[PDB]
Amino acid sequence: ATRIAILGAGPSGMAQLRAFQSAQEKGAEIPELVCFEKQADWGGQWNYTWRTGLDENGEPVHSSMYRYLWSNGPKECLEFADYTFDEHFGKPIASYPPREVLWDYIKGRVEKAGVRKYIRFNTAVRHVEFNEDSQTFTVTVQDHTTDTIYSEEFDYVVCCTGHFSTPYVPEFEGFEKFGGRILHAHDFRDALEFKDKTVLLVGSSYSAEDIGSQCYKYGAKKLISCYRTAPMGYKWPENWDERPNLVRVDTENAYFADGSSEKVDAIILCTGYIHHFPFLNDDLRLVTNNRLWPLNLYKGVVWEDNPKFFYIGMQDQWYSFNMFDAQAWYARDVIMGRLPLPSKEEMKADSMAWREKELTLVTAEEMYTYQGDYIQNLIDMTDYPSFDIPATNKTFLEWKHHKKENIMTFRDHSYRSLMTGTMAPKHHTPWIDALDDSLEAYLSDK
Amino acid sequence: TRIAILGAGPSGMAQLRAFQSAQEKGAEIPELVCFEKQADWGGQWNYTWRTGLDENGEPVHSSMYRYLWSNGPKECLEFADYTFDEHFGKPIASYPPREVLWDYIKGRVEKAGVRKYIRFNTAVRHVEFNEDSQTFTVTVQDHTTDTIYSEEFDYVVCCTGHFSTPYVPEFEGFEKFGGRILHAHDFRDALEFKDKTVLLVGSSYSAEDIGSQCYKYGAKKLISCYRTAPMGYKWPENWDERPNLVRVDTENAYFADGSSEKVDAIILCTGYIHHFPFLNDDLRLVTNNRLWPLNLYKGVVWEDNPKFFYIGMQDQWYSFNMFDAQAWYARDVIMGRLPLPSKEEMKADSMAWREKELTLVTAEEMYTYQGDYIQNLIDMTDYPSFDIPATNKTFLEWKHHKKENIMTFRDHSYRSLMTGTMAPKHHTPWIDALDDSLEAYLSDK
Numbered sequence: 098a099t100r101i102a103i104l105g106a107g108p109s110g111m112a113q114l115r116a117f118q119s120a121q122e123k124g125a126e127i128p129e130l131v132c133f134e135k136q137a138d139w140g141g142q143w144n145y146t147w148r149t150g151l152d153e154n155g156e157p158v159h160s161s162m163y164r165y166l167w168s169n170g171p172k173e174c175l176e177f178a179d180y181t182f183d184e185h186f187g188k189p190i191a192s193y194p195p196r197e198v199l200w201d202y203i204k205g206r207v208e209k210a211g212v213r214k215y216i217r218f219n220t221a222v223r224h225v226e227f228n229e230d231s232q233t234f235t236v237t238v239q240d241h242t243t244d245t246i247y248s249e250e251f252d253y254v255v256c257c258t259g260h261f262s263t264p265y266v267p268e269f270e271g272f273e274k275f276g277g278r279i280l281h282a283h284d285f286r287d288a289l290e291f292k293d294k295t296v297l298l299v300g301s302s303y304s305a306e307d308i309g310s311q312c313y314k315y316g317a318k319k320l321i322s323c324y325r326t327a328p329m330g331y332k333w334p335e336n337w338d339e340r341p342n343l344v345r346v347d348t349e350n351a352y353f354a355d356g357s358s359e360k361v362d363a364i365i366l367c368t369g370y371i372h373h374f375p376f377l378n379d380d381l382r383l384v385t386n387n388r389l390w391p392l393n394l395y396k397g398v399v400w401e402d403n404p405k406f407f408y409i410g411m412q413d414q415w416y417s418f419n420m421f422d423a424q425a426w427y428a429r430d431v432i433m434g435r436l437p438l439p440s441k442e443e444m445k446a447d448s449m450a451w452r453e454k455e456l457t458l459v460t461a462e463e464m465y466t467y468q469g470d471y472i473q474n475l476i477d478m479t480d481y482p483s484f485d486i487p488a489t490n491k492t493f494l495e496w497k498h499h500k501k502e503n504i505m506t507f508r509d510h511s512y513r514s515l516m517t518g519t520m521a522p523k524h525h526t527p528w529i530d531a532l533d534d535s536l537e538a539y540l541s542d543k
Numbered sequence: 544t545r546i547a548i549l550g551a552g553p554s555g556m557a558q559l560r561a562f563q564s565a566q567e568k569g570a571e572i573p574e575l576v577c578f579e580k581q582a583d584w585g586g587q588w589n590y591t592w593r594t595g596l597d598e599n600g601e602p603v604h605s606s607m608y609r610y611l612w613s614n615g616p617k618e619c620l621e622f623a624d625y626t627f628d629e630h631f632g633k634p635i636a637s638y639p640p641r642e643v644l645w646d647y648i649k650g651r652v653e654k655a656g657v658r659k660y661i662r663f664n665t666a667v668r669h670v671e672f673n674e675d676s677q678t679f680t681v682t683v684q685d686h687t688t689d690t691i692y693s694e695e696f697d698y699v700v701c702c703t704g705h706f707s708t709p710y711v712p713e714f715e716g717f718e719k720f721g722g723r724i725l726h727a728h729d730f731r732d733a734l735e736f737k738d739k740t741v742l743l744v745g746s747s748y749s750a751e752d753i754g755s756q757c758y759k760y761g762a763k764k765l766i767s768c769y770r771t772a773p774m775g776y777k778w779p780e781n782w783d784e785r786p787n788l789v790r791v792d793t794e795n796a797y798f799a800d801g802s803s804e805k806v807d808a809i810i811l812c813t814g815y816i817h818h819f820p821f822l823n824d825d826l827r828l829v830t831n832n833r834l835w836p837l838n839l840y841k842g843v844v845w846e847d848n849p850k851f852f853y854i855g856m857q858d859q860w861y862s863f864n865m866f867d868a869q870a871w872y873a874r875d876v877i878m879g880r881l882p883l884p885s886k887e888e889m890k891a892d893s894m895a896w897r898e899k900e901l902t903l904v905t906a907e908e909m910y911t912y913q914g915d916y917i918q919n920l921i922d923m924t925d926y927p928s929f930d931i932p933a934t935n936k937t938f939l940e941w942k943h944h945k946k947e948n949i950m951t952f953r954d955h956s957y958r959s960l961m962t963g964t965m966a967p968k969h970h971t972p973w974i975d976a977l978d979d980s981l982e983a984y985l986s987d988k
């Protein structure tokens with residue numbers, strides 16, 4: 098029988114399992130599946146941990162997610178086309194659910210799919226090697242439950258290990274002398290730790306504004322955002338200052354290209370992440386900056402130097418969960434022989450055409466629309482439930498407008514589901530006052 | 544032949560120095576390549592502000608923190624081939640700060656001229672033994688070029704340490720605790736805990752000292768809980784000893800006796816695991832931290848593959864002089880100077896050492912054991928013999944001074960066992976010596 102290795106059981110790994118299960122449910126014969134996951138449970142980023150740095154087994158802590166994290170875009174923009182919010186929750190819910198609520202949702206799909214049986218948890222992928230003599234992959238893993246290292250043979254490999262977990266952490270002059278905490282966004286966990294404190298937020302990557310917003314919400318004395326890029330455009334609260342790039346620090350103070358100086362209690366480097374695959378040699382290893390179109394990926398999924406190796410979710414993310422679905426459905430159909438691949442030259446030429454287009458994008462609206470077009474291209478090739486992508490783009494547009502109107506209240510807005518048409522109700526508590534982040538409090542009418 | 548040395552900490556440096564000394568005496572030495580993931584040598588001694596993952600996404604290696612001073616008497620770590628009198632040109636106190644000790648460590652290794660063998664910013668990804676060619680393939684990631692390459696080697700000496708990958712147990716309610724939870728490995732600056740109540744869990748390597756640093760730099764209260772036997776130390780007024788932790792909530796810690804207390808931060812001083820992600824089970828050492836790990840002939844030679852070597856993998860009562868003794872021995876085995884017995888005979892010898900290890904109860908017995916182990920290694924090579932029995936006695940003096948007063952043991956002086964020099968009293972008592980710089984230590988203050 099054909100054997101598939103799925104690396105990671107986050108949203109992308111779960112999507113790959115769901116894809117194969119969906120084909121089987123429709124009556125098709127699917128290959129044997131093995132999914133490796135270093136954590137004790139599925140959900141990837143969405144599986145919260147108090148741990149930072151290295152985990153219970155000495156593996157790098159994967160999740161970058163923090164307490165009180167809520168959906169950053171409308172839930173309506175990440176809804177599964179094959180498993181709606183209506184089906185899972187049985188009632189309408191607001192448009193920006195807390196982490197635990199969205200975790201419950203993504204788990205619900207694969208729980209009902211019955212795919213947990215394919216996953217080996219607490220198992221870290223150590224190496225993937227392609228054997229030219231057999232046309233198969235040797236995947237070496239460390240099972241931390243047995244404390245054993247073993248390897249198995251696989252015909253295809255799908256890498257779903259994410260790219261928002263290995264931090265890019267630049268040093269600034271004086272960091273060794275600084276008296277307060279220095280952490281990366283990746284280590285940020287509890288905004289309460291910074292109550293009545295002055296927090297310096299360095300950079301403009303994914304979590305810069307939200308981490309600042311959490312610190313604000315949970316009672317930080319002052320926030321300072323310093324970054325090299327163009328103004329974020331947002332009207333910050335009274336106790337929140339903006340600065341140009343940080344230059345140096347001392348024992349207590351930060352110094353900027355401004356010439357200005359200020360006392361800071363903690364520094365949070367919101368400087369992003371690197372694509373990091375220590376289990377892969379250079380023949381298979383994706384090397385790219387975070388962007389909408391990394392090269393060497395045919396249809397953004399197929400590794401062009403070895404078309405039996407696949408990557409899911411390695412692009413920067415406006416769309417997320419239903420993008421991973423589109424990708425997983427495509428990867429499944431290629432593996433199952435339903436979508437034969439063109440030549441290596443033909444693959445590269447297609448990938449370059451998408452790259453050329455990527456380089457022309459100049460607005461946020463053009464960016465998510467480009468990703469929408471990419472997803473539309475993927476779903477047209479498979480049996481993934483068709484959904485309204487132009488209407489999803491307009492929801493993103495509305496979300497963008499809401500952030501412009503007020504950066505602290507954008508999460509209080511409601512949107513129409515594009516799968517069911519369900520109009521999300523107003524939440525029972527404004528975001529700024531909703532200090533309890535639990536699933537229980539969110540789903541309760543109070 | 545070609546040798547791969549994994550890591551350029553004290554152990555990797557010891558292995559390099561072993562070969563260079565053999566060459567200095569007129570012998571023909573194998574080709575040496577040392578792989579080190581950090582930007583410079585020193586291992587633990589290369590302090591960093593960084594925690595968790597480094598600039599390249601590799602686990603941060605050093606566990607060392609600001610204000611760290613020598614653990615025991617410097618006289619007990621003093622190099623058998625390079626004295627403190629040689630390096631500093633003057634007598635200094637018995638417990639030098641990290642920077643001062645590092646100056647001393649780097650002084651010997653710079654003199655040896657072994658830096659040329661080391662490839663820095665380079666992380667070892669995999670080591671695999673090839674049965675067909677009887678050689679090792681070492682796969683490596685050069686972070687300067689961001690390229691992964693492999694090279695062939697005849698022998699491999701693993702010096703990657705065992706105090707860097709933390710054992711981090713979970714307690715009930717950790718998910719909801721409102722304060723910082725960190726491992727000793729993540730501890731950097733005691734000033735972060737000024738005016739705060741700190742809970743220290745466990746009794747591993749840095750438990751006592753981390754609490755002492757927090758105390759010295761202005762922590763409000765300190766609470767210690769552990770599973771091992773109490774030492775009966777005379778802790779300060781704001782230092783509290785409790786039964787072991789069972790539970791936490793949003794801001795309180797709950798203990799076995801039923802008592803509770805508000806805590807601002809929790810530091811898990813719970814030790815480390817032997818973790819070698821670059822090795823498969825054929826070469827991979829599996830052991831708890833102890834004086835005699837199994838499968839290591841003379842504590843060094845991997846018994847399932849005698850061409851693989853481990854340095855410094857034992858628990859460290861002795862440190863630098865042990866790595867030297869081990870490195871000199873590994874060198875002599877690699878060079879064919881010392882023939883190895885059979886696998887069956889190697890394992891029998893290891894069992895005898897293990898059975899002896901299991902009889903040990905007191906600190907004195909454990910020092911003597913490790914001292915005996917080191918003497919055995921030195922007897923087989925040309926490494927200069929040193930006064931082990933008197934070193935044991937100096938260790939026990941230190942232990943006696945810790946029992947007299949845990950906060951002032953660093954103010955005591957001890958006699959050098961290499962030169963006979965009695966260490967002078969430091970110009971500033973430990974509790975008042977807030978500056979940890981080399982400049983402030985060596986000058987008149």
Ligand SMILES: Cc1cc2nc3c(=O)[nH]c(=O)nc-3n(C[C@H](O)[C@H](O)[C@H](O)COP(=O)(O)OP(=O)(O)OC[C@H]3O[C@@H](n4cnc5c(N)ncnc54)[C@H](O)[C@@H]3O)c2cc1C
Nearest residue numbers: 105107108109135141142168169221222258259261410417
């Ligand atoms: C702080 C933060 C907030 C975010 N907020 C949102 C949001 O609000 N809305 C949204 O749509 N998206 C958000 N995202 C984007 C996020 O990337 C996606 O939502 C989603 O989690 C991506 O899923 P994934 O499976 O591709 O990767 P991940 O979720 O990161 O999952 C990867 C999985 O692979 C496993 N793995 C990695 N290496 C190994 C190994 N060597 N061996 C075994 N297993 C391994 C990991 O344990 C993990 O389970 C956020 C991301 C971050 C970092």
